[PDB]
Design a protein around this ligand. Structure first.
Ligand SMILES: [Zn+2]
Ligand SMILES: [Zn+2]
Ligand SMILES: [Zn+2]
Length: 178
């Protein structure tokens, strides 16, 4: 197995996947690495299994159909994995914890949002459809763009949004377009 966490790229107390060489900190893995379960398969392996069981699940989909899906176990898992993919990028530190807003010439967003809040929400089964999760995710970046206006720091939002969106199109097999 790897000797660093797959998400944060640091060593520490790591849990090793039984079906692939990845390793995780307990709370870096999403969901948090399970207490017992020998063998244990990580989220990457669980997502691979879904594809393998139903190869046609990789044919193209319309985003509007994906968003209306109810959060049954497989969609729950896919949103967990997509969230995990954003945390995999070091630039996610900016959006992880609860933000605050005091900048001359700007007002804070009406509905603040952040990764750890989406993480809790998924854990607590607060989203009933994929749309719930994707809306909160996109709101993180939109709040950032609006607040930081013409400061160059706005680019961090564009950058982390692009990671989210690429992973969304991959995980949920959105039909490719020009
Ligand atoms: Zn980690
Ligand atoms: Zn694995
Ligand atoms: Zn099938």
């Amino acid at each position: 197995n790897s000797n660093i966490c797959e998400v944060c790229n640091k060593w520490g107390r790591l849990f090793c996947c039984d079906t692939c060489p990845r390793s995780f900190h307990e709370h870096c893995h999403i969901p948090s690495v399970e207490a017992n379960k020998n063998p244990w398969s990580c989220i990457f392996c669980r997502i691979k299994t879904i594809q393998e069981r139903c190869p046609e699940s990789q044919s193209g989909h319309q985003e509007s159909e994906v968003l209306m899906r109810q959060m049954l176990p497989e969609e729950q898992l896919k949103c967990e994995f997509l969230l995990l993919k954003v945390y995999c990028d070091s630039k996610s530190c900016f959006f992880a914890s609860e933000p605050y807003y005091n900048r001359e010439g700007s007002q804070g967003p009406q509905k603040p949002m952040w990764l750890n809040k989406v993480k809790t929400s998924l854990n607590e089964q607060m989203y009933t459809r994929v749309e719930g999760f994707v809306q909160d995710m996109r709101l993180i970046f939109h709040n950032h763009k609006e607040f930081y206006r013409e400061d160059k720091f706005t680019r961090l939002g564009i950058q982390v949004q692009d990671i989210f969106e690429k992973n969304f199109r991959n995980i949920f097999a959105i039909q490719e377009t020009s």
